[PDB]
Amino acid sequence: PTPEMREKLCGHHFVRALVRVCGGPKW
Amino acid sequence: AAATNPARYCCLSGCTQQDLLTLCPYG
């Protein structure tokens, strides 16, 4: 089912996976 | 995508780099 991986990004897990792909200055 | 709250959704079911990509470069 697609070459992706829906990580169960919970709370900080998400904000982290976040700072990874878009790398924002906020967080 | 387009189901429930951001992080809340990415926490329960999951979220790939893309589903994350659509939630990182904003805040």
UniProtKB/Swiss-Prot annotation, chain A:
Source organism of this protein record: Homo sapiens (Human)
Protein's recorded name: Insulin-like 3 B chain
Gene this protein is translated from: INSL3
Effect listed in the UniProt record for changing residue 25 to S: Found in a male with undermasculinised genitalia and intra-abdominal testes; uncertain significance
Top-level lineage group: Eukaryota
Segment of the intact protein contained: 25 to 51 of 131
